């Protein structure tokens, strides 16, 4: 590739980093340093209290929620020996999940997804992980995460997380994220179940608006889940010195889970295409029915007006005052042609 | 043979800027033979040929500077994409300038050719006016370090000015898209969707022009010819990232425009329903009435409907009754 240089964007100082995001409301740093027998946990807002955890024998977990503060992330990167380009990728939000291996750390970018039923908004939030020799750094974007089970496991000494190093912590965090992807998928299931009956019963503009926004949402889900699958494949097929061989079997389960997730996404895309077809069919059927009404009226009453005009023209030679002064046979002709048209329409099974 | 392909065939002028660390000479001439010995100056020089339709001047310039006629064909081939060709003598570059005006939402380009020879740069334009005015000001008034450097830095400055013009065009397109988003999400119409189509075509052309530009910059800084020389490579590395920014913005704009166009265009069958409902509710209540008029307009002698207790008001009352019941029935059908 290239030599891992800085971007040097335009209209901007040569060596500055810009937070490429929207959330600029909250900031906090939670440190959870756990060992075999005892642990510490605290939440502060000053970065000077979390740096001395770099040279910690016991595994520790430093969660910086809120990366709009470029000063704190820059200080953390300077202390922990993080490359400036890695910091730039940490702050840059508009990028797909990815994994990079370095000498002293492994740097991963993943994404959380929150589906709000109101307004049907699928929000994506980057979460970045850096696994160092002893400590795991997680940079979030805003308050709210899916690692509460991991925090409960660490606090309550549940599972085997308290007697394993930081690589198992990274595995647990990635596993929690992939597990929450399943909850996102089942929410998509429920919303699609809601959508289908509205599509096939109330075909209006909001229906196709929602359907197309959801097609875009599933395209985004595919585009963000395939790189996650590649990340996990590179994770369990490489085995950098940072992670030990005793944890590699744990990543295969996460890989299988992501395989299942990708299959579910493909099924979702197929269902979405079918649903759009259903909408088109229903709308065409409605216009076909109103069109039946129009063509029935036109077919029945066009030849009648034709023959009325035929017998209504001013010509000198009318064989008209014949067969009971003409009018009754004309009325009978109208009646017989009308009943013929009605019967023919009945033989076709509409009106 | 040399044939001009473009359509700008009304302007021609030669502009020469020979600048050193302490001296500068700028002039405008229309004689090809006067500017030829400028290769003798060890100091960098900048020759600008504004008119391509005068093929004699470019032919003579190629003859004197010794460039293989395929580059002449490429220069005169206006319909092209940005490209880079490397030779043991000179570097050939084809770029595209862009012009955008807010009133008439249309985009027009202008191919510009650059040839970098030993201590010399030649640029072939197509008409009066370009985007290299800041470079001219920097050379003339000794603002930056352009004088202290050779012609490679001059090529750098020209490409950088072109990229800044690309940024300005992107700002204009951003304003256009911001207007169009509300214009189509509030009051959709045929004119708005036509503007959306035009914007999509403009974005397609812009991306088709910007991707080869990124490739040209990559080839410019990655594998360095002796002409480029090391001291300019860190500068050429920046324009690649500028092109990265431009390409990312173009991709985002294209995605937004495509999404908006699809969102509008996926709602044609509802309009079909509306027009069918209108035509049906209008023609359903008038064909019976015209039929009744035809029945009562026949030329029948001794017809029963001669005079029956105000027959005309009775007939119009009957037709009004049937029209009223038919129009009421359609409301029951939600039409």
């Amino acid at each position, epitope marked *: 590739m290239e030599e891992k240089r800085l971007s040097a*964007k*335009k*209209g*901007l*100082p*040569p*060596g*500055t980093l*810009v*937070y*490429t*995001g*929207k959330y*600029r*409301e909250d900031f906090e740093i939670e440190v959870m340093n756990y060992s075999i027998e005892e642990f510490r946990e605290f939440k502060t807002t000053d970065v000077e209290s979390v740096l001395p955890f770099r040279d910690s024998s016991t595994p520790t977990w430093i969660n910086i929620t809120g990366i709009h503060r*470029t*000063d704190v992330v*820059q200080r953390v990167g300077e202390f922990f020996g993080i490359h400036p380009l890695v910091l730039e990728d940490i702050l840059n939000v*508009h990028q797909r999940p990815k994994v990079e291996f370095f000498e002293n750390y492994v740097f991963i970018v993943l994404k959380m997804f929150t589906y709000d039923k109101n307004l049907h908004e699928l929000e994506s939030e980057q979460v970045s992980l850096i696994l160092t020799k002893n400590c795991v750094l997680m940079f979030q974007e805003k308050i709210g995460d899916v690692f509460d089970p991991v925090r409960e496991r660490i606090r309550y000494n549940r599972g085997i997380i308290r007697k394993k190093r930081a690589d198992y912590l990274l595995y647990s965090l990635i596993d929690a994220l992939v597990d929450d992807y399943f909850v996102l998928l089942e929410k998509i299931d429920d919303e699609i179940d809601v959508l289908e009956e509205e599509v096939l019963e109330r075909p209006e503009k909001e229906t196709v608006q929602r359907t197309h926004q959801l097609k875009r949402n599933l395209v985004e889900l595919r585009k963000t889940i395939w790189p996650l699958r590649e990340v996990l494949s590179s994770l369990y097929r490489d085995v950098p010195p940072l992670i030990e061989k005793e944890t590699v079997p744990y990543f295969r389960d996460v890989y299988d889970h992501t395989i299942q997730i990708a299959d579910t996404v493909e099924t979702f895309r197929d269902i979405v295409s079918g649903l759009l077809d259903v909408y088109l069919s229903s709308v065409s059927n409605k216009t076909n029915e109103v069109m039946k009404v129009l063509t029935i009226i036109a077919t029945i009453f066009m030849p009648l007006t034709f023959i009325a005009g035929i017998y209504g023209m001013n010509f000198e030679y009318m064989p008209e005052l014949r067969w009971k002064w003409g009018y009754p046979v004309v009325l009978a002709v109208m009646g017989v042609i009308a009943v013929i048209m009605v019967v023919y329409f009945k033989k076709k099974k509409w009106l | 043979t040399l044939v001009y392909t473009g359509k700008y065939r009304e302007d021609f002028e030669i502009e020469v800027m020979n600048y050193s660390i302490e001296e500068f000479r700028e002039f405008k001439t229309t004689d090809v033979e006067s500017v030829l010995p400028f290769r003798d100056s060890s100091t960098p020089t900048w020759i600008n040929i504004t008119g391509i339709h005068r093929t004699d001047v470019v032919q003579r310039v190629g003859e004197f500077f010794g460039i293989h006629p395929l580059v002449l064909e490429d220069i005169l081939n206006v319909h092209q994409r940005p490209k880079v060709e490397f030779f043991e003598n000179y570097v050939f570059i084809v770029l595209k300038m862009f012009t955008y005006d807010k009133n008439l939402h249309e985009l027009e380009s202008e191919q510009v050719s650059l040839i970098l020879t030993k201590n010399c740069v030649l640029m072939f334009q197509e008409k009066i006016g370009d985007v290299f005015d800041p470079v001219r000001e920097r050379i003339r008034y000794n603002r930056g370090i352009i004088r202290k450097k050779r012609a490679d830095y001059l090529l750098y400055s020209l490409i950088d000015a072109l990229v800044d013009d690309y*940024f*300005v065009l*992107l*700002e*204009k397109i*951003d*304003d256009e898209i*911001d*207007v169009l988003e*509300e214009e189509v999400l509030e009051r959709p119409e045929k004119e708005t969707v036509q503007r959306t189509h035009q914007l999509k075509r403009n974005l397609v052309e812009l991306r088709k022009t910007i991707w080869p530009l990124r490739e040209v910059l990559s080839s410019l800084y990655r594998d360095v010819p002796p002409l480029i020389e090391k001291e300019t490579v860190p500068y050429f590395r920046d324009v690649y990232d500028h092109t990265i*920014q*431009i390409a*990312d*913005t173009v991709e*985002t704009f294209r995605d937004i425009v495509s999404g908006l166009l699809d969102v509008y265009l996926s709602s044609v069958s509802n309009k079909t329903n509306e027009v069918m409902k209108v035509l049906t509710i209008i023609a359903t209540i008038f064909m019976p009435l015209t039929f009744i008029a035809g029945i009562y307009g026949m030329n029948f002698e001794y017809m029963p409907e001669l005079r029956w207790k105000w027959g005309y008001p009775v007939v119009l009352a009957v037709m009004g009754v049937i029209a009223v019941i038919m129009v009421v029935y359609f409301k029951k059908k939600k039409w």
Partner: antibody
Amino acid sequence: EVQLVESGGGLVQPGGSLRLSCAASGFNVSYYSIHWVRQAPGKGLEWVASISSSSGSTSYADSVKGRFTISADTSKNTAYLQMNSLRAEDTAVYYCARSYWYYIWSYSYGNAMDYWGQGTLVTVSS
Amino acid sequence: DIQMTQSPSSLSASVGDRVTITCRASQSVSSAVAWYQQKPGKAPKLLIYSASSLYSGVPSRFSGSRSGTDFTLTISSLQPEDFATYYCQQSSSSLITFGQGTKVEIK
């Protein structure tokens, strides 16, 4: 926690140079831009200068270009503005603001000033 | 440079009504417009950045909208604490410029 405090304002004769110091407390000046904003008495806000301490890249308004000078000292966490050849209309209150870059598109960025200083009044007369 | 013409130059409105102030850029700015509020005799307080987003720590009544080069600030329901001078600022270029201000009075 973050505080911006200016100093150095006072009466100066025309053509006399005085330095305005913007002491920065609660943050590191190296990670943020520092902008000076001049407000004439009874007039609207006007931008005058800017500085990026990380790279030492300055930006001056056309009204003070080549006459003023802005410098930032990361060691003492302070940004200094030097106003040589001070003229008559420069009499105004000077605000020091810390700005942060935000992202709009891949090609466009903008800066917004979170915290402003108290503002020191500079008077040029007599 | 870029001139940011702000209108109206002075607005009068009581408490509880919607107030709209507009500023027009001379040329294109890519939504890099911020809105600041200054009480008489105090430092300005930032309200709007990116011409739509809301700064963290201001009432939600303030809103920002953009249409081409027209940037509008709207207060949905005024309060006695919202009678100050409002300034636009374009930051697309390195040389940033301010609006001339819009003092909001009472009736």
